[PDB]
């Protein structure tokens, strides 16, 4: 039995799409969800830059990634197919219900093993030897050291300090999100933005003058009715787990890097290649905003409306148990669209089919940014952003993008 093993970008897309149901049955934040999709990645993109001379490794560029293990040239390895192993592999161990990893790892090994045993057998040892690299490296990021480390501490004392909000009052997610270690950022406050607004109640300051944009904005959603453009828009981009089934806004984004790389055929290395680049810009994105979440802490627009305006009123989006200030959507989505736009081109149209499974209509776009001003701006329609954790956000997460893609030296050919 020596038939070849042919392995295809979607075979890479079906490891991905498996661990984001995962995530979702198994409720990973969406920070968390960014360490999730970044680390297999990286490994299988590794095995696709140590075999192919138009990719560049990424050890030395990666904060502490080292050279992964060469491939042993006596043996006959399909390089794809140790690249899907090694993400398949990293991918089961960084999520919780790892039976639901294996049973697709098994029925592709079944197929492969059934054509040619031991192109799958010396290709499977490979991928998995990548694999254990990637993974020591990946175990001193201090992930496991901020699993024990205090809840965020809530003070009504303190009067613009971040609360829990109702129905379900939960502690922030994620409070030391900030202590995790970057992929290719300095430090994790290298993007630190602009401090907010003070926290105000006085009608001619800065704040209170966003705290009523809210509230207005809100109101004539209302006034126009139910469906209308702007509730859609708010439920697309909503990516909220905790609502009380739905992807995180990282999810989402993999999901619009794949739409963009089936569009254009790309082929296994170059669609490897964008979600590589495009994951890590994102999980150091959400590093980045976290770090600002947890340092300003500020207020989420209902608790104040509520105790201080209007009693009766309610965001059209259930509010994120987190602080307001940077938005994630803003930056993350800021972030993966100059990824993609470098990688894939500008005005890129694409149709969003990624929220059809999750309950949603499919959205066009002309643009990846068009897509990410879109992902900002739903939060204000949303009622769960002030206007410049929106604003702010954007630059942030554009900047740090930028930052990313003029960094990292991947595609390089030979030729
Ligand atoms: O995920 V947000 O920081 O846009 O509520
Ligand atoms: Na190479």
Redesign the pocket.
Known sequence: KEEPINITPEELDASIDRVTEIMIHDIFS?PVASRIFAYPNVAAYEIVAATNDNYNSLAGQLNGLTAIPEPDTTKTINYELAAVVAHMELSKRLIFSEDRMESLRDSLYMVWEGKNPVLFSDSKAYGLQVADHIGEWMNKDNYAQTRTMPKFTVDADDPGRWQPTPPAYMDGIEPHWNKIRPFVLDSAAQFKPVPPPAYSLEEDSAFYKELKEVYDVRNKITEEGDSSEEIQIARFWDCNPYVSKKIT?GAHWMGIAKIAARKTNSDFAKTLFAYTKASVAMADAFISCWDEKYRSNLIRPETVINQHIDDSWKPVLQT?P?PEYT????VVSGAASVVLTEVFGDNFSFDDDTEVPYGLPIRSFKSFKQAADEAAIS?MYGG??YRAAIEVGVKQGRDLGTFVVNKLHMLSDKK
Do not use: E, L
Not at 327 to 330: A, D, I, T, V, W
């Open positions: 969406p806004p994120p987190f938005s994630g959507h803003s939060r769960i952003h």
